C-alpha cells in the first residue's frame, strides 16, 4: 500500500515537502502437476472373477487420486515442489492465525468459541471468512459440548454463516488440525486434466530385474492420471501488506 | 450429574468413533434401563437434562 | 486401498515414471452352528395337567 502523511507549510524546511510513496503488485501462479497410478492384474484373474474387477479398480484409483489432492492442499503432505503457495496448515500457522482448542466444559476456546476467534483473525486480516473444512469429528463434538451444569451448550447448531465441508477420504490429519476457516474467494484449484483412464495390454512397467512386460505375462493394467494446480491468494488488503486468507483451529494437547 | 460421558454423551462419543472409521452408525442396542435413565438424568441444579 | 502419487515429468529421470499399486480383498464367513435343548416330562403328568 502507499503511505500518506501530514505535510505542513514551508518553502524551505524538510517539512512542507510531500513525501513520495509506492503501490506494488506481486505474482501468484497456478502450476499444473500430475498425479497418477498404474494397477496391473493377470488377465486370467479378470476372466475367472465373479465381478467387473476393472470397474472397481478404476473407482478405487479415482478415490486414491482425490485423497492425494486433499493431502497436498490442506496439510502439505507430498505437495509437489512447483506449487509455491503454502498448504492451508502452513499458511495459517506462519500467519500466526492458529488457535488451540480447549476441550471439556463450554468456554471461549471450545469448538464454537475457537472457530469464532479464528474467523475474527481472518476478518481482522481484511478477508471475509466463509468456508469451514473439518473431519466428521466436529459435527458430533459440537452436538455434545456441555455447559457447567451439564446441559447441551449448542443444541441449535451454530457454524451458521460458514459453508461447511467434511473430509471423508482419509486425507484429514487430526493431530494437526481440528478445522480450517478460510475466505473461499482466495483459494483456487486448477483442474488442468480431470481423472482419465487408459487400459494397458502391451506396455512394459519398470526396467532391469523389476521389468513387467505385460503381454508376455498375460497381464493387463489400468493407468489413471490427472493434472491439478493450487494457489492461495496471500495479498495486501486495506489492513496491510501480507495478509493470509485462512486460519486453523489446532487440537487440545494440554492435559487438565 | 449430566456430563460429556452421560448416557447421551457416551452414545454420541461412540457414534463419532464409528463415523470416523467411515461406517454409518444407525442402530442402538440396550437394556430397558436406558429409557428410564435418560428420562431421569439431572443437571447440576437438579432439573431434568433430557426432557425431549 | 491403492495409492496414487505426484509422478513428475521426464524421458530419463527416476522421476516421471508412474508408480504401480494394488487393490486387495479378504474373506468373511457365515458358519452355521446348532443350538438346542431337550425337556423331559412324565407321561402321567401330561395326562393329568389341565392345560396343553
UniProtKB/TrEMBL annotation, chain B:
Protein location: Virion
Record-given protein name: Major capsid protein
Taxonomic lineage of the native organism: Viruses, Duplodnaviria, Heunggongvirae, Uroviricota, Caudoviricetes
Gene (UniProt): 13
Whole sequence portion shown: 157 to 208 of 312
